[PDB]
A paper describes a structure:
PSATs are [name]-dependent enzymes that catalyze the second step of the phosphorylated pathway – reversible conversion of 3-PHP to PSer in a Glu-linked reaction. In this work, we describe a structure of the isoform 1 of [name] PSAT from [name] (At), which is further referred to in the manuscript as [name]. The three crystal structures of [name] present snapshots along the catalytic event showing [name] internal aldimine state, complex with PMP after the first half-reaction and PSer-[name] geminal diamine intermediate state.
The [name] prosthetic group creates a Schiff base (internal aldimine) between C4′ and Nζ of K265, the residue placed in the coil between β9 and β10. Another hydrogen bond is created between the hydroxyl group of [name] and T221. It includes direct H-bonds with backbone amides of A145 and T146, which, due to the placement at the N-terminal part of the α4 helix, possess an increased positive charge. Hydrogen bonds of [name] phosphate group also involve interactions with the side chain amide of Q264 and the hydroxyl group of T146. The phosphate also forms contacts with residues of the [name] dimer mate, particularly hydrogen bonds with: the side chain amide of N306∗, the main chain amide of T307∗, and the side chain hydroxyl group of T307∗.
Residue numbers in the entry:
A (entry chain A): 69 to 430
B (entry chain B): 70 to 430
The structure:
């Protein structure tokens, strides 16, 4: 519409209006430099200030320890599915996986090209609705690392606490909950994520990697997938995604202005609770299949008992400016993605719409 | 706080009308209710944008349906690995004609994945020439022949193309992409980063003959696999949506300019102004590149009085002409004069050169 809508898309996703308007204001001529960020040399002093400020702001938000590197890369999280075992394993090493949704399953399949994989536990048998108890996971005695997807974007399953790796280090795909809450980074060897879900536009992927794990990639690693190359060149080995990194920088600066990630988590909890409570109080009209203690604050899948009404629910919500609510083809129903930048008012509008819908169709 | 004349070699200057369109669309693209930066890549609005970008590019370069057009991430440098990973077995051979340092980087990365033969290198004469094609000793069972069509640092550009004795021709056209017509049917693959001539950094275009798609090496990352990208129309994973949108705006505007025959005329005219100024300078300024292969896009030049190069660059920047410093190896200057560099910018540099020479000769 002529007014902006409430955008429940799962990735790419909604961004803060103030960030967008700042980008608009500066698009033709950034800070009297005489050019757009889209036209800046990546080796020039203006872009250097942008990428350095983005890294500094991110380090502050997540309280990233000095002994970790921060890389700003292209190729999405799917490229990292290959880069991780290429950098961190030899061809006969094993990576352990806990698979809580389909994103972890894709990571397994790609890793098989480059090392051995072991899926300790899969949620598939119960339609990806739970996280296992950690103590009873049988880890591979010589596994290089343990891989999790911290927020399974399709399935709505989120780690709250983290497993402790037995032999190696912990790797987490945090694409769809990145900068939604504090994380004790020191518990991980690698955290990675596409920016597009929670912290910027598509085209930028962030890798936070303990410095002692950088180096000794497999010989077949493309130079563009090599962590040492990226780290020693500060993400400027080749031409980076300049504009994407600038946009991420705006988002980080704004999250700090909001009070940092403790405050961000409080708002995310508050708005998620309105939606989960609406569902739970609906006497089964709406249903969420995910086990209560691991319900994602970012992605909320739900269905109707009267599934024949789902298409109508989605179409009518779009007429009321709540878009991209359709769920995954495997389950149908709906998926409300409610990332950092989803206004509280959008969640309130959806909850009120659900009320009205239920009353009309009970 | 006026806009400057921006001679950077990549990323690079973009058309002002395109930047202003992007500004106007940024918060809410066509009353869709969101930015391009917030669109689902599987939604109807983004699908219209990527499809229009492909169509417009096919019209502009005259890319027939026997070729796929892929919009990817990773830069041209990712394609240095993807090409042999997709197109070669580990014991196949690829021939290289190396006319500058970008081709040399392509050779180094290909060695990881297959055998390489550098059948000609310009290095011994400081990368100033293109070989005579008839005299190249091509490998009889080469899978493909790789060239860099425009060597961005060295200013050496192919005007005519060699005929592969076996296999097909692959060209890195990063720094001359959509600067002039190209007979696409002569090639197996044309590739290039968008950031020099057609958009911002973060998108790479790959134009690939459909019969060449598939059969990648088993070690090929899914994100480097041409069959995966082709069968999913560049939407296998989350594409660089905003970058593709920007490339689309550029392609639309190049069509509005009259297409690539017209773009080439403008490029030739403004390059000639600069090269003529260099050659008429009685040696004060010098271009090392052999005349018939001088790039229309990247113009490297030095001063006879090398000690004045720093003053030249600094004073030019005071006159709103920025990013003219040349490569560390040969010093001097490099004026990158891509499609979107205004004619007035080249005129100003030419005037600046004339005044500088009068002052210091």
């Amino acid at each position: 519409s002529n007014a902006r809508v409430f955008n429940f898309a799962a990735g790419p996703a909604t961004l803060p209006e103030n960030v967008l308007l700042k980008a608009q204001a500066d698009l033709y001529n950034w800070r009297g430099s005489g050019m757009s960020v889209m036209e800046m040399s990546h080796r020039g002093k203006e872009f250097l200030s942008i990428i350095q400020k983005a890294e500094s702001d991110l380090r502050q938000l997540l309280e990233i320890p000095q002994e970790y590197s921060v890389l700003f890369l292209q190729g999405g999280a799917t490229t990292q599915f290959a880069a991780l075992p290429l950098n961190l394993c030899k061809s006969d090493d094993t990576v352990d996986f806990v698979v809580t949704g389909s994103w972890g399953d894709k990571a397994v399949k790609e890793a098989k090209k480059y090392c051995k994989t072991n899926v300790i536990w899969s949620g598939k048998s119960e339609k990806y609705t739970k996280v296992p108890s950690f103590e009873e996971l049988e880890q591979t005695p010589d596994a290089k690392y343990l891989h999790i997807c911290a927020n399974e974007t399709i399935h709505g399953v989120e780690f709250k606490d983290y497993p402790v790796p037995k032999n190696g280090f912990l790797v987490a795909d945090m694409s769809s909950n990145f900068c939604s809450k504090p994380v004790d980074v020191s518990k991980f060897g690698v955290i990675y994520g596409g920016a597009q879900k929670n912290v910027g536009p598509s085209g930028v992927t962030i890798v936070i990697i303990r410095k002692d794990l950088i180096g000794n990639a497999q010989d077949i690693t493309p130079v563009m997938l090599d962590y040492k190359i990226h780290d020693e060149n500060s993400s400027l080995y080749n031409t980076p995604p300049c504009f994407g990194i600038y946009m991420c920088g705006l988002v980080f600066e704004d999250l700090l202005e909001q009070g940092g990630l403790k405050e961000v988590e409080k708002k995310n909890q508050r708005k998620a609770d309105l939606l989960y409570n609406a569902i739970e109080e609906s006497n089964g009209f709406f249903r969420c299949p995910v086990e209560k203690s691991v319900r994602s604050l970012m992605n909320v899948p739900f269905t109707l008992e009267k599934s024949e009404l789902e298409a109508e629910f989605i179409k009518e919500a779009a007429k009321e400016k709540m878009v991209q609510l359709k769920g995954h083809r495997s389950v149908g129903g709906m998926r409300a993605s409610i990332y950092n930048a989803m206004p509280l008012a959008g969640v309130e509008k959806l909850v009120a719409f659900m009320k009205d819908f239920q009353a009309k169709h009970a």
